[PDB]
C-alpha cells in the first residue's frame, strides 16, 4: 500500500530542481536504461523537456557503472537525470557526481545510503511501493513529466509500454500507480484495457506463433512447437494463420476457455492459469496489426532496438518517427528467434552445465546466449520446469564488451520470496566481495562480476542466500 500523495510531493521537489536548470538554459543530460522501461522513460523526458523548450542529450546504456560515471564527471553538463536506473548506484553517484545536480527516476530498492542536497532520489519504494508491481521507471518518469506539465498525460500509453516491458502485470493485472497512469490514459482516450490472452503477438503474429512463443507462462506441449500449435488450433476450430486481433470477441472467449481447459488437463498451476488471461493495454492511436497498437508488442519492438545497441532509434519510435519505426520493425524477428534458440539451448544443456547449490542454480552459458538475454533465459529455466522454482536461478554470460567480464541475471518465484530470499540484497552483498556490481529487486536482480571470480561467486552466493532463509 503506497503513499501516493507523499510520493507525488517528492516528484514536485525534483520538478522544482529541474525547472531551476531549465530557466537558465542548462542542457539536461539524460542517462536511461536500454530496455523498454528505459527507452520509454527517455522518450517521456524528451517530449516533456521539449514542451518546456529545454535542451537535452540522451544516452541509452546497459547499466550504471563506475566507469560510465568516471566519464560523466568530466563531461560538461550541470544537471544529470537518471531514468529507469541508478537506485543501486547511489554511493557511486554520490562519490563521483558530488559537484553536479542529479535526479534519479527509478523504482529499484534503493541503496541504503544518504544523499547530498542536490541529488534527489525519486523512488516509489521509499513510499511503500512494491518495486515490481506498483510502478516502473517509465511510470516514475511519467509522473515527473505530468507534474512538470499536465499536457504530458498524453504520454500515459508510452509509460504503460514500459511497465509491460518490465512485466509489472505479470500476475495478470496492474497494481499501484500504474492504475493511475491507466486512468489518465483512459480519460484522454489514448489507451484501453482489455481482458485478453496475455501473450506476445496480438498484432503481428499468427495465432500458432502466439501459442508456440508462450513461455510466461508456457502452454503445455505447445510451447516451442509450431506444428502442434497449428494442430491444436485447427481441432478447436481456429484458423492458425489468423492473428489474435482478427478474432471476434466471441472467438477470443472460446479460445480462452479452450486454453484454460487445456492448462487444467495438463496439470498447470493455478497461478499460471490465472495470469494467462488478464489486462492487455491497447491504443487507438495506432492501427490494428501495428505492433504499437498493443503494449507488449510495442515493448518487444523497443527491446529489439536495444538488442542491437540502437536504443536511440526506439526513443524516436516512441516520439512518432515513422522512419525509425520502419527500421525497428525489421529487428523484431531476429530478436524472437534468438529467444527460441536460447530456450532450446537451455533444454539441451541445463542438466550437464548447471551448478546446483543448496540455495541457488548457477548456469554459465559462456557466449551461447547473448548477455542481454540471460534474464529471459533465467525466467525460461523456471517456467519450463528445469529448475526447482523455490531455488533461485542465476544465468551468466560473457559481456559483449569485455570477455573477462560476466553479466548475470537472477530470477526466482513468489514462494521462494516467502522463504526469505532477496536476490537484490544477496547479489549486492556478493558483488562487494568479488569486486563487482550488483543489485535489483527481491525477485529479479542483476550482477556484473569479473570472470575469474565465478567459482568463488557460486560458493559465496549460495552461502549468502542460505543466510537469508527465515
Ligand atoms: Cl538483470
Ligand atoms: Mn525498470
Short mmCIF file of C-alpha atoms and ligand atoms in Angstrom, two decimals:
data_model
loop_
_atom_site.label_atom_id
_atom_site.label_comp_id
_atom_site.label_asym_id
_atom_site.label_seq_id
_atom_site.Cartn_x
_atom_site.Cartn_y
_atom_site.Cartn_z
CA UNK A 1 0.00 0.00 0.00
CA UNK A 2 1.55 3.23 -1.26
CA UNK A 3 1.53 6.82 -0.04
CA UNK A 4 0.77 8.26 -3.46
CA UNK A 5 0.50 11.89 -2.32
CA UNK A 6 3.77 11.79 -0.39
CA UNK A 7 5.48 10.31 -3.44
CA UNK A 8 3.98 12.97 -5.71
CA UNK A 9 5.25 15.66 -3.32
CA UNK A 10 8.66 14.10 -3.80
CA UNK A 11 8.12 14.36 -7.56
CA UNK A 12 7.33 18.07 -7.26
CA UNK A 13 10.60 18.58 -5.37
CA UNK A 14 12.54 17.06 -8.27
CA UNK A 15 10.46 19.10 -10.73
CA UNK A 16 11.32 22.38 -8.98
CA UNK A 17 15.02 21.47 -9.20
CA UNK A 18 14.85 20.74 -12.93
CA UNK A 19 12.97 24.00 -13.56
CA UNK A 20 15.92 25.78 -11.90
CA UNK A 21 18.19 24.46 -14.65
CA UNK A 22 15.62 24.77 -17.45
CA UNK A 23 15.13 28.50 -16.89
CA UNK A 24 18.92 29.04 -17.01
CA UNK A 25 19.15 27.26 -20.37
CA UNK A 26 21.10 24.32 -18.96
CA UNK A 27 21.15 21.29 -21.24
CA UNK A 28 19.66 18.30 -19.43
CA UNK A 29 21.96 15.27 -19.60
CA UNK A 30 19.80 12.13 -19.64
CA UNK A 31 21.01 8.59 -18.88
CA UNK A 32 18.42 5.85 -19.39
CA UNK A 33 18.32 2.06 -19.50
CA UNK A 34 18.44 0.02 -22.69
CA UNK A 35 15.22 -1.96 -22.16
CA UNK A 36 11.68 -0.82 -22.97
CA UNK A 37 11.27 0.67 -19.49
CA UNK A 38 14.29 2.90 -20.11
CA UNK A 39 13.60 3.69 -23.75
CA UNK A 40 10.06 4.85 -22.95
CA UNK A 41 11.45 6.80 -19.98
CA UNK A 42 13.87 8.71 -22.20
CA UNK A 43 11.10 9.37 -24.73
CA UNK A 44 8.86 10.75 -21.97
CA UNK A 45 11.69 13.03 -20.81
CA UNK A 46 12.42 14.07 -24.40
CA UNK A 47 8.80 15.05 -25.05
CA UNK A 48 8.32 16.72 -21.65
CA UNK A 49 11.56 18.69 -21.84
CA UNK A 50 10.72 19.58 -25.44
CA UNK A 51 7.38 21.07 -24.38
CA UNK A 52 9.33 23.31 -21.98
CA UNK A 53 11.73 24.39 -24.74
CA UNK A 54 14.66 22.82 -22.86
CA UNK A 55 17.67 21.19 -24.48
CA UNK A 56 18.75 17.67 -23.60
CA UNK A 57 21.19 14.91 -24.52
CA UNK A 58 20.16 11.27 -24.13
CA UNK A 59 22.45 8.25 -23.79
CA UNK A 60 20.96 4.74 -23.71
CA UNK A 61 23.22 2.49 -21.63
CA UNK A 62 23.21 -1.06 -20.28
CA UNK A 63 23.79 -0.17 -16.62
CA UNK A 64 25.13 2.47 -14.25
CA UNK A 65 28.79 1.51 -13.84
CA UNK A 66 31.70 3.18 -12.10
CA UNK A 67 33.41 3.51 -15.50
CA UNK A 68 30.38 5.24 -17.03
CA UNK A 69 30.37 7.65 -14.09
CA UNK A 70 34.10 8.39 -14.43
CA UNK A 71 33.25 9.76 -17.88
CA UNK A 72 30.07 11.59 -16.83
CA UNK A 73 32.02 13.64 -14.27
CA UNK A 74 34.31 15.21 -16.89
CA UNK A 75 31.58 15.85 -19.47
CA UNK A 76 30.25 19.40 -19.02
CA UNK A 77 26.58 19.36 -18.06
CA UNK A 78 25.22 20.94 -14.89
CA UNK A 79 22.32 18.54 -14.24
CA UNK A 80 22.02 14.79 -14.86
CA UNK A 81 18.78 12.80 -14.94
CA UNK A 82 19.00 9.03 -14.49
CA UNK A 83 15.79 7.28 -15.56
CA UNK A 84 14.94 3.58 -15.11
CA UNK A 85 18.32 3.09 -13.39
CA UNK A 86 20.52 4.49 -10.64
CA UNK A 87 18.76 3.26 -7.50
CA UNK A 88 21.53 0.72 -6.90
CA UNK A 89 24.36 3.18 -7.62
CA UNK A 90 23.67 5.96 -5.11
CA UNK A 91 27.04 5.79 -3.34
CA UNK A 92 28.89 5.85 -6.68
CA UNK A 93 26.75 8.74 -7.92
CA UNK A 94 27.39 10.40 -4.55
CA UNK A 95 31.15 9.82 -4.82
CA UNK A 96 31.59 10.97 -8.43
CA UNK A 97 28.71 13.36 -9.21
CA UNK A 98 29.29 15.29 -5.97
CA UNK A 99 29.77 18.59 -7.84
CA UNK A 100 26.64 18.37 -10.01
CA UNK A 101 22.87 18.25 -9.68
CA UNK A 102 21.47 14.73 -10.09
CA UNK A 103 17.90 13.44 -10.34
CA UNK A 104 17.20 9.69 -10.21
CA UNK A 105 13.84 8.48 -11.55
CA UNK A 106 13.85 4.76 -10.74
CA UNK A 107 11.91 2.06 -8.92
CA UNK A 108 14.51 -0.43 -7.64
CA UNK A 109 15.03 -0.98 -3.91
CA UNK A 110 17.42 1.89 -3.22
CA UNK A 111 20.89 1.54 -1.77
CA UNK A 112 20.56 2.41 1.92
CA UNK A 113 22.85 5.46 1.89
CA UNK A 114 22.30 9.16 2.46
CA UNK A 115 22.31 11.64 -0.42
CA UNK A 116 23.71 15.11 -0.92
CA UNK A 117 21.39 18.10 -1.06
CA UNK A 118 21.47 18.48 -4.86
CA UNK A 119 20.88 14.75 -5.51
CA UNK A 120 17.15 13.95 -5.42
CA UNK A 121 16.02 10.32 -5.45
CA UNK A 122 12.50 9.86 -6.82
CA UNK A 123 11.63 6.27 -5.97
CA UNK A 124 8.19 4.89 -5.05
CA UNK A 125 9.70 2.09 -2.94
CA UNK A 126 10.65 4.71 -0.35
CA UNK A 127 6.90 5.47 -0.15
CA UNK A 128 5.69 1.90 0.34
CA UNK A 129 5.54 0.61 -3.24
CA UNK A 130 6.30 -2.92 -4.38
CA UNK A 131 9.19 -2.43 -6.77
CA UNK A 132 7.97 -4.87 -9.46
CA UNK A 133 4.23 -4.16 -9.46
CA UNK A 134 3.35 -0.69 -8.25
CA UNK A 135 5.37 1.49 -10.67
CA UNK A 136 8.20 1.14 -13.19
CA UNK A 137 10.88 3.55 -14.33
CA UNK A 138 8.72 4.91 -17.14
CA UNK A 139 5.96 5.41 -14.58
CA UNK A 140 8.21 7.48 -12.31
CA UNK A 141 9.25 9.47 -15.38
CA UNK A 142 5.59 9.85 -16.34
CA UNK A 143 4.57 11.40 -13.02
CA UNK A 144 7.68 13.57 -13.19
CA UNK A 145 6.56 14.80 -16.62
CA UNK A 146 2.93 15.18 -15.53
CA UNK A 147 3.91 17.39 -12.58
CA UNK A 148 6.12 19.45 -14.90
CA UNK A 149 3.25 19.93 -17.37
CA UNK A 150 -0.23 18.39 -17.21
CA UNK A 151 -0.26 18.15 -21.02
CA UNK A 152 2.22 15.27 -20.57
CA UNK A 153 -0.70 12.99 -19.66
CA UNK A 154 -0.74 12.16 -23.38
CA UNK A 155 2.37 10.06 -22.62
CA UNK A 156 0.38 7.66 -20.42
CA UNK A 157 0.39 4.87 -23.02
CA UNK A 158 4.15 5.16 -23.59
CA UNK A 159 4.61 4.91 -19.82
CA UNK A 160 2.44 1.78 -19.76
CA UNK A 161 4.51 0.22 -22.56
CA UNK A 162 7.47 0.48 -20.20
CA UNK A 163 5.54 -1.07 -17.31
CA UNK A 164 4.55 -4.01 -19.52
CA UNK A 165 8.15 -4.34 -20.69
CA UNK A 166 9.08 -4.55 -17.00
CA UNK A 167 6.29 -7.13 -16.56
CA UNK A 168 4.51 -5.19 -13.82
CA UNK A 169 1.29 -7.05 -14.75
CA UNK A 170 2.98 -10.45 -14.59
CA UNK A 171 0.28 -11.83 -12.28
CA UNK A 172 -2.35 -10.79 -14.84
CA UNK A 173 -3.44 -7.33 -13.60
CA UNK A 174 -1.96 -3.90 -12.98
CA UNK A 175 -1.31 -2.55 -9.48
CA UNK A 176 -0.27 0.60 -7.67
CA UNK A 177 0.07 3.85 -9.57
CA UNK A 178 0.12 2.00 -12.88
CA UNK A 179 -3.66 2.06 -12.43
CA UNK A 180 -3.47 5.85 -12.03
CA UNK A 181 -1.48 6.10 -15.27
CA UNK A 182 -4.11 3.91 -16.93
CA UNK A 183 -6.89 6.22 -15.73
CA UNK A 184 -5.10 9.26 -17.17
CA UNK A 185 -4.73 7.43 -20.49
CA UNK A 186 -8.38 6.36 -20.40
CA UNK A 187 -9.65 9.91 -19.79
CA UNK A 188 -7.70 11.07 -22.86
CA UNK A 189 -8.87 8.08 -24.91
CA UNK A 190 -5.30 7.11 -25.86
CA UNK A 191 -5.35 3.65 -24.29
CA UNK A 192 -7.83 0.91 -23.48
CA UNK A 193 -7.59 -2.05 -21.10
CA UNK A 194 -8.85 -5.43 -22.33
CA UNK A 195 -9.18 -8.85 -20.70
CA UNK A 196 -7.33 -10.94 -23.28
CA UNK A 197 -4.67 -13.59 -23.78
CA UNK A 198 -1.51 -12.13 -22.19
CA UNK A 199 0.95 -13.34 -24.82
CA UNK A 200 3.21 -11.69 -27.37
CA UNK A 201 1.82 -11.49 -30.88
CA UNK A 202 -1.67 -9.96 -30.59
CA UNK A 203 -0.99 -7.62 -33.53
CA UNK A 204 1.72 -9.02 -35.82
CA UNK A 205 1.85 -12.77 -35.25
CA UNK A 206 -0.36 -15.65 -36.41
CA UNK A 207 -2.17 -17.50 -33.64
CA UNK A 208 0.06 -20.57 -33.84
CA UNK A 209 3.19 -18.50 -33.21
CA UNK A 210 1.44 -16.70 -30.35
CA UNK A 211 0.88 -20.06 -28.68
CA UNK A 212 4.29 -21.52 -29.56
CA UNK A 213 6.12 -18.40 -28.28
CA UNK A 214 4.33 -18.61 -24.91
CA UNK A 215 6.97 -19.06 -22.21
CA UNK A 216 5.44 -16.93 -19.43
CA UNK A 217 3.53 -18.99 -18.75
CA UNK A 218 4.20 -21.92 -21.07
CA UNK A 219 1.33 -23.73 -22.78
CA UNK A 220 1.94 -27.48 -22.27
CA UNK A 221 3.07 -29.49 -25.32
CA UNK A 222 2.54 -26.37 -27.44
CA UNK A 223 5.33 -24.04 -26.30
CA UNK A 224 8.20 -24.19 -28.77
CA UNK A 225 6.25 -26.41 -31.21
CA UNK A 226 4.54 -24.51 -34.02
CA UNK A 227 3.37 -27.73 -35.70
CA UNK A 228 1.45 -28.88 -32.61
CA UNK A 229 0.15 -25.34 -32.07
CA UNK A 230 -1.28 -25.47 -35.60
CA UNK A 231 -2.90 -28.85 -34.97
CA UNK A 232 -4.43 -27.76 -31.66
CA UNK A 233 -5.90 -24.54 -33.07
CA UNK A 234 -7.42 -26.36 -36.05
CA UNK A 235 -9.02 -29.06 -33.89
CA UNK A 236 -10.53 -26.32 -31.70
CA UNK A 237 -11.93 -24.57 -34.78
CA UNK A 238 -9.47 -21.69 -35.23
CA UNK A 239 -7.57 -20.58 -38.32
CA UNK A 240 -3.93 -20.87 -37.18
CA UNK A 241 -2.81 -18.17 -39.63
CA UNK A 242 -5.34 -15.69 -38.23
CA UNK A 243 -3.96 -13.03 -35.92
CA UNK A 244 -5.44 -12.71 -32.44
CA UNK A 245 -6.68 -9.17 -33.12
CA UNK A 246 -8.60 -10.51 -36.13
CA UNK A 247 -10.65 -12.80 -33.87
CA UNK A 248 -14.10 -11.63 -32.84
CA UNK A 249 -14.78 -11.03 -29.17
CA UNK A 250 -16.69 -14.32 -29.22
CA UNK A 251 -13.89 -16.40 -30.75
CA UNK A 252 -11.49 -14.84 -28.24
CA UNK A 253 -13.60 -16.02 -25.29
CA UNK A 254 -13.90 -19.52 -26.74
CA UNK A 255 -10.14 -19.62 -27.30
CA UNK A 256 -9.61 -18.61 -23.66
CA UNK A 257 -11.91 -21.40 -22.44
CA UNK A 258 -10.13 -23.98 -24.58
CA UNK A 259 -6.73 -22.77 -23.34
CA UNK A 260 -7.85 -22.82 -19.70
CA UNK A 261 -9.28 -26.32 -20.14
CA UNK A 262 -6.02 -27.28 -21.85
CA UNK A 263 -3.94 -25.91 -18.95
CA UNK A 264 -6.04 -27.87 -16.45
CA UNK A 265 -5.90 -31.15 -18.40
CA UNK A 266 -2.08 -30.99 -18.36
CA UNK A 267 -1.75 -30.12 -14.67
CA UNK A 268 -0.72 -26.48 -14.97
CA UNK A 269 -0.56 -24.50 -11.76
CA UNK A 270 -3.40 -22.27 -10.63
CA UNK A 271 -1.22 -19.14 -10.68
CA UNK A 272 -0.25 -19.74 -14.32
CA UNK A 273 -3.87 -20.26 -15.38
CA UNK A 274 -4.88 -17.05 -13.59
CA UNK A 275 -2.24 -14.94 -15.35
CA UNK A 276 -2.75 -16.40 -18.84
CA UNK A 277 -5.81 -14.16 -19.33
CA UNK A 278 -5.60 -10.65 -17.93
CA UNK A 279 -5.10 -6.97 -18.57
CA UNK A 280 -3.96 -6.16 -22.11
CA UNK A 281 -3.45 -2.47 -22.89
CA UNK A 282 -4.13 -1.29 -26.44
CA UNK A 283 -4.01 2.16 -28.05
CA UNK A 284 -6.46 3.50 -30.66
CA UNK A 285 -3.74 5.99 -31.66
CA UNK A 286 -2.33 3.20 -33.84
CA UNK A 287 -3.99 0.84 -36.33
CA UNK A 288 -4.67 -2.79 -35.54
CA UNK A 289 -1.97 -5.11 -36.84
CA UNK A 290 0.66 -2.47 -35.95
CA UNK A 291 2.92 -3.54 -33.04
CA UNK A 292 2.46 -0.09 -31.48
CA UNK A 293 -1.25 -0.89 -31.06
CA UNK A 294 -0.52 -3.14 -28.04
CA UNK A 295 1.82 -2.54 -25.12
CA UNK A 296 3.61 -5.90 -25.08
CA UNK A 297 4.22 -5.77 -28.84
CA UNK A 298 5.34 -2.14 -28.54
CA UNK A 299 7.71 -3.07 -25.71
CA UNK A 300 9.09 -6.01 -27.69
CA UNK A 301 9.68 -3.62 -30.60
CA UNK A 302 11.66 -1.30 -28.32
CA UNK A 303 13.67 -4.15 -26.80
CA UNK A 304 14.63 -5.24 -30.32
CA UNK A 305 16.22 -1.85 -30.99
CA UNK A 306 18.14 -2.01 -27.71
CA UNK A 307 19.32 -5.54 -28.53
CA UNK A 308 21.34 -4.15 -31.45
CA UNK A 309 22.54 -1.10 -29.44
CA UNK A 310 20.05 1.11 -31.31
CA UNK A 311 18.02 2.28 -28.32
CA UNK A 312 18.03 5.88 -29.54
CA UNK A 313 16.10 4.58 -32.54
CA UNK A 314 13.47 3.14 -30.19
CA UNK A 315 13.18 6.53 -28.50
CA UNK A 316 12.46 8.06 -31.90
CA UNK A 317 9.78 5.40 -32.45
CA UNK A 318 8.03 6.44 -29.24
CA UNK A 319 8.19 10.08 -30.39
CA UNK A 320 6.49 9.24 -33.70
CA UNK A 321 9.41 8.97 -36.14
CA UNK A 322 7.86 6.74 -38.80
CA UNK A 323 11.26 6.19 -40.45
CA UNK A 324 12.68 4.87 -37.18
CA UNK A 325 9.59 2.67 -36.89
CA UNK A 326 10.14 1.16 -40.34
CA UNK A 327 13.71 0.28 -39.34
CA UNK A 328 12.74 -1.02 -35.89
CA UNK A 329 10.07 -3.29 -37.39
CA UNK A 330 12.83 -5.23 -39.19
CA UNK A 331 14.59 -6.11 -35.91
CA UNK A 332 11.81 -7.96 -34.09
CA UNK A 333 12.04 -11.28 -35.96
CA UNK A 334 15.70 -11.96 -35.15
CA UNK A 335 15.00 -10.92 -31.54
CA UNK A 336 12.25 -13.51 -31.10
CA UNK A 337 14.32 -16.11 -32.97
CA UNK A 338 17.23 -15.67 -30.56
CA UNK A 339 14.89 -16.29 -27.62
CA UNK A 340 13.70 -19.55 -29.20
CA UNK A 341 17.25 -20.78 -29.76
CA UNK A 342 18.07 -19.77 -26.17
CA UNK A 343 15.26 -21.97 -24.83
CA UNK A 344 16.37 -24.91 -26.98
CA UNK A 345 19.93 -24.50 -25.69
CA UNK A 346 18.60 -24.43 -22.12
CA UNK A 347 16.67 -27.67 -22.59
CA UNK A 348 19.73 -29.35 -24.11
CA UNK A 349 22.45 -28.12 -21.76
CA UNK A 350 20.80 -27.47 -18.38
CA UNK A 351 21.45 -30.88 -16.81
CA UNK A 352 25.08 -31.07 -17.96
CA UNK A 353 26.14 -27.47 -17.23
CA UNK A 354 24.14 -26.11 -14.27
CA UNK A 355 25.84 -25.72 -10.89
CA UNK A 356 23.26 -26.60 -8.24
CA UNK A 357 23.96 -25.48 -4.68
CA UNK A 358 21.81 -25.72 -1.59
CA UNK A 359 20.07 -22.41 -2.36
CA UNK A 360 20.76 -21.45 -6.00
CA UNK A 361 21.30 -22.68 -9.54
CA UNK A 362 24.26 -21.07 -11.31
CA UNK A 363 24.45 -21.60 -15.07
CA UNK A 364 27.36 -20.25 -17.12
CA UNK A 365 26.49 -20.26 -20.82
CA UNK A 366 29.73 -18.60 -21.94
CA UNK A 367 28.50 -16.88 -25.10
CA UNK A 368 25.87 -19.40 -26.21
CA UNK A 369 23.23 -16.91 -25.00
CA UNK A 370 23.57 -13.15 -25.52
CA UNK A 371 24.40 -11.15 -22.40
CA UNK A 372 21.13 -9.21 -22.82
CA UNK A 373 19.15 -12.48 -22.83
CA UNK A 374 20.32 -14.04 -19.55
CA UNK A 375 17.32 -12.53 -17.77
CA UNK A 376 14.92 -14.20 -20.20
CA UNK A 377 16.95 -17.42 -20.00
CA UNK A 378 16.73 -17.49 -16.20
CA UNK A 379 12.98 -16.90 -16.35
CA UNK A 380 12.63 -19.56 -19.06
CA UNK A 381 14.52 -22.10 -16.96
CA UNK A 382 11.93 -21.66 -14.20
CA UNK A 383 8.86 -21.59 -16.45
CA UNK A 384 9.98 -24.70 -18.37
CA UNK A 385 10.35 -26.70 -15.15
CA UNK A 386 14.11 -27.19 -15.47
CA UNK A 387 14.71 -25.60 -12.06
CA UNK A 388 13.03 -26.23 -8.72
CA UNK A 389 11.10 -22.94 -8.64
CA UNK A 390 11.77 -22.38 -4.91
CA UNK A 391 15.51 -22.31 -5.71
CA UNK A 392 16.72 -19.08 -7.37
CA UNK A 393 18.36 -19.28 -10.80
CA UNK A 394 21.35 -17.23 -11.97
CA UNK A 395 22.46 -17.29 -15.62
CA UNK A 396 25.89 -15.88 -16.55
CA UNK A 397 27.20 -14.95 -19.99
CA UNK A 398 30.31 -13.15 -21.20
CA UNK A 399 29.58 -9.47 -21.74
CA UNK A 400 29.60 -8.13 -25.29
CA UNK A 401 32.23 -5.52 -24.36
CA UNK A 402 34.71 -7.45 -22.17
CA UNK A 403 35.36 -11.21 -22.39
CA UNK A 404 36.88 -11.15 -18.88
CA UNK A 405 33.59 -9.71 -17.57
CA UNK A 406 30.38 -11.63 -16.86
CA UNK A 407 26.78 -10.43 -16.86
CA UNK A 408 24.41 -12.39 -14.63
CA UNK A 409 20.67 -12.17 -14.10
CA UNK A 410 18.96 -13.78 -11.11
CA UNK A 411 15.29 -14.78 -11.20
CA UNK A 412 13.07 -16.64 -8.74
CA UNK A 413 9.42 -17.14 -7.77
CA UNK A 414 6.96 -15.84 -5.19
CA UNK A 415 7.10 -18.79 -2.82
CA UNK A 416 10.90 -18.54 -2.78
CA UNK A 417 10.45 -14.95 -1.60
CA UNK A 418 8.15 -16.40 1.07
CA UNK A 419 11.15 -18.42 2.27
CA UNK A 420 13.11 -15.18 2.74
CA UNK A 421 15.17 -14.95 -0.45
CA UNK A 422 16.03 -11.45 -1.68
CA UNK A 423 18.09 -11.58 -4.87
CA UNK A 424 18.89 -7.86 -4.99
CA UNK A 425 20.27 -7.82 -1.46
CA UNK A 426 22.19 -11.08 -1.87
CA UNK A 427 23.75 -10.08 -5.20
CA UNK A 428 24.66 -6.64 -3.84
CA UNK A 429 26.48 -8.27 -0.92
CA UNK A 430 28.25 -10.82 -3.12
CA UNK A 431 29.19 -8.08 -5.60
CA UNK A 432 31.12 -6.12 -2.95
CA UNK A 433 33.16 -9.26 -2.19
CA UNK A 434 34.29 -10.18 -5.73
CA UNK A 435 34.99 -6.63 -6.98
CA UNK A 436 31.74 -6.49 -8.93
CA UNK A 437 28.48 -4.53 -9.12
CA UNK A 438 25.06 -5.93 -8.35
CA UNK A 439 21.57 -5.28 -7.11
CA UNK A 440 17.95 -5.30 -8.14
CA UNK A 441 14.53 -6.36 -6.92
CA UNK A 442 13.89 -9.14 -4.41
CA UNK A 443 12.53 -11.41 -7.17
CA UNK A 444 14.77 -10.24 -10.04
CA UNK A 445 18.29 -8.83 -9.92
CA UNK A 446 21.44 -8.46 -11.97
CA UNK A 447 25.16 -8.62 -11.26
CA UNK A 448 28.39 -7.99 -13.17
CA UNK A 449 31.48 -9.84 -11.92
CA UNK A 450 34.89 -10.50 -13.50
CA UNK A 451 35.07 -13.97 -14.99
CA UNK A 452 37.93 -15.06 -12.71
CA UNK A 453 35.68 -14.87 -9.63
CA UNK A 454 32.97 -17.19 -11.00
CA UNK A 455 33.71 -20.30 -8.94
CA UNK A 456 34.20 -18.17 -5.82
CA UNK A 457 30.93 -16.35 -6.52
CA UNK A 458 28.92 -19.58 -6.75
CA UNK A 459 30.07 -20.63 -3.27
CA UNK A 460 29.61 -17.08 -1.96
CA UNK A 461 26.13 -16.50 -3.39
CA UNK A 462 24.91 -19.90 -2.13
CA UNK A 463 26.07 -19.01 1.39
CA UNK A 464 24.57 -15.51 1.28
CA UNK A 465 21.22 -16.81 0.02
CA UNK A 466 21.30 -19.52 2.68
CA UNK A 467 21.69 -16.90 5.42
CA UNK A 468 18.50 -15.19 4.20
CA UNK A 469 16.29 -18.29 4.63
CA UNK A 470 13.98 -17.47 7.56
CL1 LIG B 1 19.14 -8.32 -14.76
MN1 LIG B 2 12.83 -0.99 -14.61
#
